[PDB]
Amino acid sequence: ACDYTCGSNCYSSSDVSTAQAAGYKLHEDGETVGSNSYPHKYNNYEGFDFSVSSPYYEWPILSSGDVYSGGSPGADRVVFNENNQLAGVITATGASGNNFVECT
Structure with missing residues (x-):
C-alpha cells in the first residue's frame, strides 16, 4: 500500500527522502523557494509527539512526485x-483551520 498516507496521497519512504534531502539542502545553503519561502520553521502548535529534537522545518512534499520549486505548495509537508532527522509527515488535509494532522 503506502509508507505514508496524507489524506488521499500515498508516499513511499523514497518520496519522503527525495523531499527531505532537497528541503534540507536549501536550509543549509541559506536559500529558499517561492512566495512563502520554504523551507521555513515549523512551530508544533498541534503538539505532535516528534521524538527528534527541535527546531523543526517544513517543506512541501508533492503528490505529483516532483520536488517543490515554487508555486502551489500543496497541503502535505515533510x-x-x-x-x-525526519520528525514526521504532516498534512493540512483533515484538520480544523491551520491545524495539521499527521499523515498515517
Whole structure:
C-alpha cells in the first residue's frame, strides 16, 4: 500500500527522502523557494509527539512526485530538524483551520 498516507496521497519512504534531502539542502545553503519561502520553521502548535529534537522545518512534499520549486505548495509537508532527522509527515488535509494532522 503506502509508507505514508496524507489524506488521499500515498508516499513511499523514497518520496519522503527525495523531499527531505532537497528541503534540507536549501536550509543549509541559506536559500529558499517561492512566495512563502520554504523551507521555513515549523512551530508544533498541534503538539505532535516528534521524538527528534527541535527546531523543526517544513517543506512541501508533492503528490505529483516532483520536488517543490515554487508555486502551489500543496497541503502535505515533510518536517525535519537541523541534523536532518525526519520528525514526521504532516498534512493540512483533515484538520480544523491551520491545524495539521499527521499523515498515517
